[PDB]
């Protein structure tokens, strides 16, 4: 069983460098090519680099202008990328992926890591402010504003309320902080008796907030 386990999310300032690792298991590490691919939020896939472990000379997509290096450690069956001189154009999910057997070719990419989010920004890590969106059908919700970086999750009534819930993609504000809303539609009759609490979790800042949304 192939596994490709990447390191955790990173936050960097412009000008810095980032290292992401990918621990491979379940196959002969040195007999397959390995690839890096990235995806900026809401955008398409971008192929970055390829090597084969233990004696490969990596090669790099030319638009990275030499900022990207790929390495491997065969005794740890791990591949790395180092991307230097970062800008906000480099904010992306970075994927490691196994390519073809070395006797077959370089592609296709049959197994993919879980992805590593790298956020490049001058902003510093910050939990959100949570504000109520107060209401025959009532819409109510929570505005989860001014946090950094992604991601946040939102539940309602500790997960007991799932029907009618819409949690929107975050938007990146000109301040460099994110903002998102989560809404739910409920019967207007229930507003008097039923309680509605949004549970917001911003793991990057270690923040959990509960907000009761009242009429």
């Amino acid at each position: 069983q192939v596994q490709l386990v990447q390191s955790g999310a990173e936050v960097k300032k412009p000008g810095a460098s980032v290292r992401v690792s990918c621990k491979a298991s379940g196959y002969t590490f040195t007999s397959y090519f390995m690839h890096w691919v990235r995806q900026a939020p809401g955008q398409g896939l971008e192929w970055m680099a390829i090597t084969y472990p233990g004696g490969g000379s990596p090669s790099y997509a030319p638009q990275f202008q030499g900022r990207l290096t790929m390495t491997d450690d065969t005794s740890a069956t791990t591949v790395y990328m180092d991307l230097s001189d970062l800008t906000s154009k480099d904010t992306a999910v970075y994927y490691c992926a196994r390519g073809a057997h070395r006797s077959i070719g370089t592609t296709p990419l049959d197994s993919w890591g879980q992805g590593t989010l790298v956020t490049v920004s001058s902003a510093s890590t910050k939990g959100p402010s949570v504000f109520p969106l107060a209401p025959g059908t009532a819409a109510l919700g929570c505005l989860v504003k001014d946090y950094f970086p992604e991601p946040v999750t939102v539940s309602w009534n500790s997960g007991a309320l799932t029907s009618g819930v819409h949690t929107f993609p975050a938007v990146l504000q000109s301040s460099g902080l994110y903002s998102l809303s989560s809404v739910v539609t409920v019967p207007s009759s229930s507003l008097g008796t039923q309680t509605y609490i949004c549970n917001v979790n911003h793991k990057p800042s270690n923040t959990k907030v509960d907000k009761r949304v009242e009429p």
Binding site: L45, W47, P108, L143
Partner: protein, 218 residues
Amino acid sequence: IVMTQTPLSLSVTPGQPASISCKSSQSLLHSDGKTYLYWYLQKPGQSPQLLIYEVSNRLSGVPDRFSGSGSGTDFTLKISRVETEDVGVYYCMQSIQVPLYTFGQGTRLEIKRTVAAPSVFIFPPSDEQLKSGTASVVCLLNNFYPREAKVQWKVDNALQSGNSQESVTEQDSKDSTYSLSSTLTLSKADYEKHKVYACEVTHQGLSSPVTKSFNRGE
């Protein structure tokens, strides 16, 4: 080498077939019969997964309703009968020459359904937020189809531009509708200088644009 995918978005009634095309700027036929064009599907929140490799070969475990064809520059991915699990973004990828591999821009496959007009709601800023000096006014368009929609913000009947952002949910699996939220941001000072805040929505399922408004301060 550039790959051009078409259409950018495709809506398919389930059970109907679907076709996606990928055209390369030059032949992907390696001098050996192998043509280096692969297809991937990426579902929301998930890593890409391989579907078709070397033009027409189905990957292990891929259901046989999927097939690919094409010999040099024009490639097509076909789905016998669109099950609703197939919604996502399809990418073609050419790898004729290292390190010049590229992806197409992606075609989004969605479920076709009957037209459904948005239910619109408008939310004032909370008193709590106002204490901090900024005002977020939020407009919600709930459960509509198709995806294309226009939100126009108006403050005392003056058309706003440049001071709002919006985002849209993924297609809901149950009813195949989209939802959209638009946030108008002003400073508390600017907010308190006007009375009527209005969200004007244009959608195909609306014969006339719906406007939802409030007077600041109830």
